[PDB]
Amino acid sequence: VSLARGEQSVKRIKEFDPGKDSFSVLLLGIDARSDANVLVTFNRKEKTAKMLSIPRDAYVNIPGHGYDKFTHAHAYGGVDLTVKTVEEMLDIPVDYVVESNFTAFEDVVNELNGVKVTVKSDKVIQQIKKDTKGKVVLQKGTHTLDGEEALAYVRTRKADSDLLRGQRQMEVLSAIIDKSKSLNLKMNLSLKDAIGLFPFITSLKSVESIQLTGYDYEPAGVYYFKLNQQKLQEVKKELQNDLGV
């Protein structure tokens, strides 16, 4: 990619250099709706990562389109709109964005000879059996799943919910990081710069996750996830403090 934005984010008031400043990455998974939406803020002064899944049904203002589901942003305007939708939603810059489909996720999980996940629910195992028609049969405990098994894990929903599918997505993402330590992707980032970021991204001191508290909002059948505005301001201030903005 190459964002229809310029060099650095519009949200950044002062000049930005990624090799020295705290930054943010927006990972998007598309089969065009964006079904995986994970924002990660990397704090360089403290060597930490903060993850957060944006619910695909989040009642947000898509620029030039009004209030809608968050997932529709990528449908209405692709990458550039999603970033825009995020940048207005959280009042923070989206410095980097990576976009992947199923096969890219599968092939990177396989290139690492699997990612390790600790499955703890017979419910999710049963639903994955039913989803894959028996092709993917997970086990309770800590195991190394291949690309197909990882994708089935991050895709299932009916056992728990989509909001927990986001937490499963963040889990598998951090597992991918872990497995990469021992050593169809579209990026607004030269591969060389990604490799330059690789050591810092594989040497954090701690990683934390964030949730967005909200409530079901069903006007005339269509489902939306309305965000608790107080917790939203809280998370916005936290991310701004993390990024130094």
Curated annotation (Swiss-Prot):
| Record GO terms (molecular function) | transferase activity
Superkingdom, natural source: Bacteria
Residue intervals on the Extracellular side: 1-245
Query: Which biological processes are named by the entry's GO terms?
Result: cell wall organization
Q: Where in the cell is it found?
A: Cell membrane
* UniProt note: phenotype after gene disruption: Single mutant has no effect on cell growth or morphology under normal growth conditions. Triple disruption of tagTUV genes is not viable.
Key words, A-Z: Cell membrane, Cell wall biogenesis/degradation, Membrane, Signal-anchor, Transferase, Transmembrane, Transmembrane helix
**What class does this enzyme belong to in the EC scheme?**
transferase
GO CC, any one term: plasma membrane
Keyword flag Hydrolase: no
UniProt record similarity statement = Belongs to the LytR/CpsA/Psr (LCP) family.
Provide the assembly information. Interacts with MreB.
Q: What does this protein do?
A: May catalyze the final step in cell wall teichoic acid biosynthesis, the transfer of the anionic cell wall polymers (APs) from their lipid-linked precursor to the cell wall peptidoglycan (PG).
Its recorded name reads: Polyisoprenyl-teichoic acid--peptidoglycan teichoic acid transferase TagT
Q: Record the organism.
A: Bacillus subtilis (strain 168)
Query: What would be the name of the gene that encodes this protein?
Result: tagT
